[PDB]
């Protein structure tokens, strides 16, 4: 998806009268149509963002498993108990004391030392990763509103074969690019990619099948056990475990409940990203300058088409205050310019609309060729009028207000 027709989110920019630069902000779910006097109309849209080489930072356990409990006890005054599970890193251990006497195995009375261990296993974890900024790629599409049909308007191969479209990537290393556009000229797009998706504010956090963009702030004060690529064991395991009251030589150890639910109140509540060895997202923005001084019109030279047109597709509402039609030209004198205006009444044929497809034309000498035309009609009732004199055709159009 590289141009605007059919997109549900669309914005219209009026380039200044005679300006050589145009500032843009490309919304990742949107499309810009830029119009300016004496210039062909352009669509530009941010297609997606891409980051490839993600480093790992830290993982959090939100559901722990407590298994294989064991206690070593000692009689009062005989020293500190040492449980040998302390030589095993997957065990968490805590010292303690219990009441001891003749009734539970000791010859003296008083506090006897105990050492209780339990195995800590992680059952499900949220793993966070980092994007280095040198590895973000913005995919951007550009389209110039030349001759198109209903079928090929969104076909990328057709439009790039007619030199009317380009997909290109901008990176922090290559923030500018010039593309040629056939006899329409060229445009240069100068972007700001490191200040588009600020990779220093965020982590990518994979939870099960999905991943998210999370504030590093929130990711750091997660009161959960954690690991990192180089660490030997889970750390701070104890905030998912309860050492229960010790009695003689026994002590119970349980895990707390899963925090899986409590992790989904956050991330509600966060930007989803597609993750498959490389992270893809369409949400986001890119700030660009578009240079248009070497962009010029093609057409103007040509004569007007002489023969009758017909409506190959009746006008349809595009959803953004414009209507799109497809014409069929019965004539053979192409290449010729299409006579198409928007009039408010058929007796007062003063033009009142405005063409989005500026300078629409039939490119070929073949008869019954099809041309698509996008127009911005005035509010209320109007007519789309194609052709002159007895070759003329019209279609009523209504554009509602509210």
Author numbering: 0 to 401
Share the article's original sentences.
The overall crystal structures of JEV SA14 and SA14-14-2 E proteins were determined at a resolution of 2.2 Å and 2.1 Å, respectively, by molecular replacement methods. Structural comparison between JEV SA14 and SA14-14-2 E protein ectodomains revealed a rotation of DI and DIII relative to DII. Interestingly, the side chain of JEV SA14 Lys279 protrudes to the bulk solvent whereas that of JEV SA14-14-2 Met279 is directed to the protein interior. Accordingly, JEV SA14-14-2 monomer provides a plausible dimer (complexation significance score (CSS), 1.00) with a nearly two-fold axis while JEV SA14 monomer cannot pack to a reliable dimer (CSS, 0.00). The area and hydrophobicity of the DII fusion loop-DIII interface of JEV SA14 dimer is decreased with the fusion loop slightly shifting away from the hydrophobic cavity in comparison with that of JEV SA14-14-2 dimer. All together, the smaller overall contact area and number of interactions and the requirement of significant rearrangements argue for a weaker monomer-monomer affinity of JEV SA14 compared to JEV SA14-14-2 E protein dimer. Due to the different DI to DII orientation of the monomer, the distance between the same residue 104 of the fusion loop increases from 25.2 Å in JEV SA14 to 46.5 Å in JEV SA14-14-2 trimers, respectively. The three elongated DII domains are tightly packed in JEV SA14 trimers and separately arranged in JEV SA14-14-2 trimers. Only in the compact JEV SA14 trimer assembly, the three conserved residues Trp101, Leu107 and Phe108 of the fusion loop form a bowl-like hydrophobic cavity.
